[PDB]
Amino acid sequence: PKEPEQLRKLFIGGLSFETTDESLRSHFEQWGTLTDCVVMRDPNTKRSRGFGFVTYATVEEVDAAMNARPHKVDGRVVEPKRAVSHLTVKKIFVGGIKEDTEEHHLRDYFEQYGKIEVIEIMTDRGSGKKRGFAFVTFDDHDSVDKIVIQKYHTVNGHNCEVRKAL
């Protein structure tokens, strides 16, 4: 069974206006099999709109392409993002961790999604007791984009609720 197509697709912004379907494809085929690759153009002038999308055969190929950023395509550094589920942030809310979840629990799990810069375990302003939720800040948005499309997150035995934090 194939992963849903929406999860295999990358928005590429910031294209050179000279990038074509063919040159975008030739670039991004370095990181996997592309089932689709389109530069968006004006319907009348055919002038590029400066963005496009590519679709890989598998999510692991999407990961490989994102891990190979920065991408310089036809001389210009472009901006790939996974398709929306774009609210582009580097921080997540992690709920449901209760009072026994510590920093190392959160770090050991989330470090495999991206490079962590801040872990904030929330405590009561008056008593200092743990409130049962936390924020994790990464150095880049793709970590968050991978995290929030998962159906489940299990950390320290708890089924957690994870969302983008703004």
UniProtKB/Swiss-Prot annotation:
Residues 8-85, 90-166 form the RRM domain. Residues 1-85 are annotated as: Globular A domain. The modification Phosphoserine is found at residue 16. There is a cross-link at residues 2, 72, 164 (Glycyl lysine isopeptide (Lys-Gly) (interchain with G-Cter in SUMO2)). Sumoylated. Signal peptide: none annotated. It is found in: Nucleus; Cytoplasm. There is a cross-link at residue 98 (Glycyl lysine isopeptide (Lys-Gly) (interchain with G-Cter in SUMO)). Residues 86-166 are annotated as: Globular B domain. Identified in the spliceosome C complex. Identified in a IGF2BP1-dependent mRNP granule complex containing untranslated mRNAs. Interacts with SEPT6. Interacts with C9orf72. Interacts with KHDRBS1. Interacts with UBQLN2. Interacts with PPIA/CYPA. Interacts (via the RGG-box) with the HOXB-AS3 peptide; the interaction inhibits binding of HNRNPA1 to the intronic sequences flanking exon 9 of the PKM gene, preventing inclusion of exon 9 and promoting inclusion of exon 10 which suppresses formation of the PKM M2 isoform and promotes production of the M1 isoform. (Microbial infection) Interacts with HCV NS5B and with the 5'-UTR and 3'-UTR of HCV RNA. Involved in the packaging of pre-mRNA into hnRNP particles, transport of poly(A) mRNA from the nucleus to the cytoplasm and modulation of splice site selection. Plays a role in the splicing of pyruvate kinase PKM by binding repressively to sequences flanking PKM exon 9, inhibiting exon 9 inclusion and resulting in exon 10 inclusion and production of the PKM M2 isoform. Binds to the IRES and thereby inhibits the translation of the apoptosis protease activating factor APAF1. May bind to specific miRNA hairpins. It is linked to Inclusion body myopathy with early-onset Paget disease with or without frontotemporal dementia 3: An autosomal dominant disease characterized by disabling muscle weakness clinically resembling to limb girdle muscular dystrophy, osteolytic bone lesions consistent with Paget disease, and premature frontotemporal dementia. Clinical features show incomplete penetrance. This is Heterogeneous nuclear ribonucleoprotein A1. It comes from Homo sapiens (Human). The gene is HNRNPA1. The chain holds residues 7 to 181 of 372 of the full protein.
